Symmetry: D2
């Protein structure tokens, strides 16, 4: 049994291959699950320095930290202690594709994250391989039940040098390891920021605010 | 020169072909452009009764009726009197595709809409050809400048009999016929409802509320 | 009843809208249905001069003219006299989409073609709107039965100025108006050429060779 | 320096995650590079028994074994001894996506393959998770130069129980580690067969024939 506390930690291990380059990342974070706020500090422990834009990894580093109104079932918080998995397809407008798969567990007051990240077909002259990205725009994700699990659809946008953007469609499927009450269609408004980085992004800190809601009308 | 009034009318002509079936629709509507509210009454004048779910047409029937905060440039309202065009790709999760193209002009206090609608690859046993849809869910559309024009990305969801949904990605490009001040990235929260229909949807009434905003945080 | 002759004519009417520009094309052609060879002469009768690359239209101008080995059922030839319809999605690598829908009938020794063509999201600086295309490469289309009808999948490539290419995925569905014997999986090797054009492509002649086959091993 | 011999061996290591399930495969094979023929024997060494259709892995297990006519440059054979990498996107018609990335080297007369495979969004009731596949159909892949590298586009089809198929678009990019002469547009006709398997596919043998060609006309 689990009663998620108003303060919880995170621990993350990510294995990635992007444009054939292997890397590993170790994360340690903290947040306020009921407030929809969290931060994480990350270290590239294998494959540094990364030859691609670190920004593509930010949204792969924590679904228990969404502020859910009492009226919308909280699929993520209800899954504990057994937890859940998620899988994501990232379709960039220049033909690049990432696939992501993730397991979320709970050890004491620490959520434990195990991530696989695979990125292919990044154009060598593109914003990702040329490291010309400048963080994600805020987003609104549609969350809805399907096939006894939960899906999330969000059109994402990376800021790029020159002041334009670079679009990526996220399709995510979230799977509880135990029976939980499914919500109805709703939305999550997100904002993810890289708060600090060293020169080659081997050391990064990032934060997210995420709040669930119904349509305003 | 144009000063859009707090009450304006709409007039629409749509030509469509879906799964090889030709049809035409005539619309007459009204709304409050600065309040983000409008309604329209439609008549299928050629190709009735429609052999497919009328719901796929609802979002092709009016961008001047978005409530824009003073702080976000209103691309649509600024385009008048010359107006704008839009083009949309609708990618359904069962492989069906619609393409839409539209011209918007202004005659007196009446916006005039001229629509081309093309739908292909609807599965014969699918919710659209089997008329098992039950209206659109609310949505949040990302609006952002690109290539001197405006784009909108929104993951849409049709309710279907049995209580599931049926997803459609909209990609829209909006093109002013004259120079206008482009906004920055923002969002439009939408809700579109079919308020009334006769038995075979030859006579439909529909309404939309649409409000532009920045991220809440 | 129909016995397709070793020489047959074609007559075509196409209505199109590309990047919001309306046009109509009238075609008259001829070929050798059992030899897989045909030609057609086309006139842009409305919307001339076309503001986009004519090449995108070539493959929308004739499935009875495929050389079918006796061992593979000929879905197209068997459909006559009632004929068939087809619908196509064209996904270009720069995000442009065309939808195509078509009816094929037979009047005497003349196949009669009625086409709807809709093209959206062509980038204004792209090879199509900048008329920098230099014809299609040859192709191999996979033909296979599904849902009591016939599908064709072919990765197409347009030659572009500078000597590169520009890819387009075709997904086609072919629907006989009467019961016919479905083939098994097979291939059609194609080559389509624009044999002549005037300066603004208002007058075009084109030819196709198409031969059905099994895998060579 | 390398002179590829008329008989060569293969050795392969693959790491995979499909629907969150980790596995590893070890391969040993042999073929006739100039004849376009090869075979491989595989062992699932971690993650056995696989909970998904083994068929999705067959085309990730060898580009030096294509019969190239003298008139078409052989990008793969020319890359040795330094070799090449490839990256693939597999888009299934039911929304599942695999990403694949690969390094090919040469040690003595043995090609050495190092593969990463990531599969997400396989529907739990789909042919892959329900192990209802019955091998790949033959295919024709378009091979063409882009961005100083080589691309391959092929619409693939998996046979499924009941006698239908299940389509997957492959987009592959091939990157030589050294300067080589690029070919022009051409085709590769393929046939891949699983020649033997034990009950849970922990032990598999497979073979491929692949021949490059120009258009027949």
């Amino acid at each position: 049994m689990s009663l998620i506390k108003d303060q919880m930690t995170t621990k993350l291990h990510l294995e990635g291959t992007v444009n054939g380059h292997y890397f590993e990342i170790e994360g340690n974070g903290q947040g306020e699950p009921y407030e929809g706020k969290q931060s994480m500090k990350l270290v590239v422990t294998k494959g540094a320095p990364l030859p691609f834009a670190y920004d593509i990894l930010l949204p792969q580093h924590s679904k228990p930290f969404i502020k859910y109104p009492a009226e919308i079932p909280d699929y993520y918080k209800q899954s504990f202690p057994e937890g859940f998995s998620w899988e994501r397809i990232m379709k960039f407008e220049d033909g690049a594709v990432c696939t992501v798969s993730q397991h979320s567990s709970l050890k004491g007051n620490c959520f434990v994250y195990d991530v696989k990240f695979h990125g292919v077909h990044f154009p060598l002259d593109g914003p990702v391989m040329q490291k010309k990205t400048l963080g994600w725009e805020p987003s609104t994700e549609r969350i809805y039940p399907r096939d006894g699990m939960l899906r999330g659809d969000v059109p994402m946008a990376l800021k790029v040098e020159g002041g334009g953007n670079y679009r990526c469609d996220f399709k995510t499927v979230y799977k509880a390891k135990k029976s939980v009450k499914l919500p109805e269609n709703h939305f999550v408004d997100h904002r993810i920021v890289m708060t600090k980085h060293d020169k080659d992004y081997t050391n990064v800190e990032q934060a997210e605010v995420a709040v669930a809601r119904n349509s305003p009308f």
